[PDB]
Amino acid sequence: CGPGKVQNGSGNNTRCCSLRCICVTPEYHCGDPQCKICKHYPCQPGQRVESQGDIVFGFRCVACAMGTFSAGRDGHCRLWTNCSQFGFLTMFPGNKTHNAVCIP
Amino acid sequence: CGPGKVQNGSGNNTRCCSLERCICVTPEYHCGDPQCKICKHYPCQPGQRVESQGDIVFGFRCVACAMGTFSAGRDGHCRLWTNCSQFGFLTMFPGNKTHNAVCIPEP
Amino acid sequence: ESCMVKFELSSSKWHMTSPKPHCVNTTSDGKLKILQSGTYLIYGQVIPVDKKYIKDNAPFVVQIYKKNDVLQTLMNDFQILPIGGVYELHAGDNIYLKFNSKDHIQKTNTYWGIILMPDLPFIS
Amino acid sequence: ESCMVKFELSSSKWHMTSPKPHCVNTTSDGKLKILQSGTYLIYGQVIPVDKKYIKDNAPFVVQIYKKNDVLQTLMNDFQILPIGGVYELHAGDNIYLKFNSKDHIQKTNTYWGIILMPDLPFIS
Ligand SMILES: *[C@@H]1O[C@H](CO)[C@@H](O[C@@H]2O[C@H](CO)[C@@H](O)[C@H](O)[C@H]2NC(C)=O)[C@H](O)[C@H]1NC(C)=O
Ligand SMILES: *[C@@H]1O[C@H](CO)[C@@H](O)[C@H](O)[C@H]1NC(C)=O
Ligand SMILES: *[C@@H]1O[C@H](CO)[C@@H](O)[C@H](O)[C@H]1NC(C)=O
Ligand SMILES: *[C@@H]1O[C@H](CO)[C@@H](O)[C@H](O)[C@H]1NC(C)=O
């Protein structure tokens, strides 16, 4: 999973805990707040997976917050890639559906 | 609604009790309780009856239709084959579970 | 001056505070026939078998009866099921349980019973 | 003696049999702390709101915690569920309820409590 983070579970219960475990299997999410088990609740592009509940999660497939994107069913708002701080300028700025492209 | 019956319930909970066991007559609807207090919806496929296990609340599964019978609809009731030989005609097509037997018209 | 009984499935025997409790005249079926009127508390857990040991498509349902009138109707996806609650009845009422299929029921660690409720007048 | 420490959710008041019960030192928020060790009986019904009234699609779950570890984990599809069961406990045990969303419960007609267990040395 990661060097400075904690691997727990196998197969679809795979997740990366910290010293907020995050299920790493795509379109799989923590079912409990402690992320004891990973559940299956896919979304669509431009949507994340909100999980209201304090012992067992229910799942709403809310759209992506402004400034982010998600181009897959997994339902995770990954942050935009600021080409400027990386070395390039941005050809297309990017939206909820899509991440920015960089001009070499 | 039925000759040896009286009508019970309305809409899709309609049922005609006899004798006191009842049958939901709205298609693909079946008694959910032993007393058939409510009719539930559990469609099946041709050649399949609807077994109902339970002593207070029924569970359902689309078991196939017993041999010697048939069911050409989704309602899930095994209607009996037409034995024309004991009834008066001969049979062209013997029939299977999905369809009813056919009998020959000329004789 | 307490009146408490408990039926276990494994032993099939009631465990009581007294040999002949004043409040009840139990049946070894698992049913019970109360004698004293007042506030009661039906309790007990009902542990079913695993969903792989099941046989029929019948759902897990547990009912509680007052005479022949239904009192409670519970159901879950074949996990632990606590039953009962506070109820006040009168002398000579039939209290027992009906299931959907007795083959759902695992006999180990399944129990029920009733206690006569000492009145609570204080508050906090 | 007889310590039944009931807690209605509407009034948020612990209806009690005794002024300061021998077995419990209750709290106002619905939690409690065990005083005397021994056998107990958690009881109570939990009335949820109607399916129409719910907002979030979070599942209906009711849990029981002893200290920090889990004691009971119940869940049904928004119907009346009873809680509790017989549990022997040590002294100073926290017994409280955590459910995923405090928004979807009926405060009216919802109660929980614990009772001390009189010894049961008789069988029939
Ligand atoms: C038995 O199952 C077969 C499934 O194909 C069906 O056979 C019938 O017989 C004719 C023969 O020419 C088939 O071409 C047709 O498919 C069927 N006839 C009709 C009118 O549908 C049929 O479902 C079953 N046959 C009987 C007699 O029950
Ligand atoms: C997001 O940007 C991409 C890149 O041009 C574009 O093809 C896509 O239509 C955009 N989507 C929205 C919703 O703006
Ligand atoms: C059955 O009848 C009820 C009216 O009581 C109606 O609301 C429902 O749509 C009907 N069909 C069903 C339950 O499939
Ligand atoms: C108690 O129950 C038994 C069940 O066999 C019955 O025979 C007996 O008459 C009951 N006791 C009384 C006092 O009715």
Numbering used by the authors:
A (entry chain C): 29 to 47, 59 to 143
B (entry chain D): 29 to 47, 58 to 145
C (entry chain B), D (entry chain A): 50 to 173
From the paper:
Glucocorticoid-induced tumor necrosis factor receptor-related protein (GITR) and GITR ligand (GITRL) are members of the tumor necrosis superfamily that play a role in immune cell signaling, activation, and survival. Upon binding to its ligand, GITRL, GITR produces costimulatory signals regulating T-cell proliferation and effector functions. Here we present structures of human and mouse GITR receptors bound to their cognate ligands. Both species share a receptor–ligand interface and receptor–receptor interface; the unique C-terminal receptor–receptor enables higher order structures on the membrane.
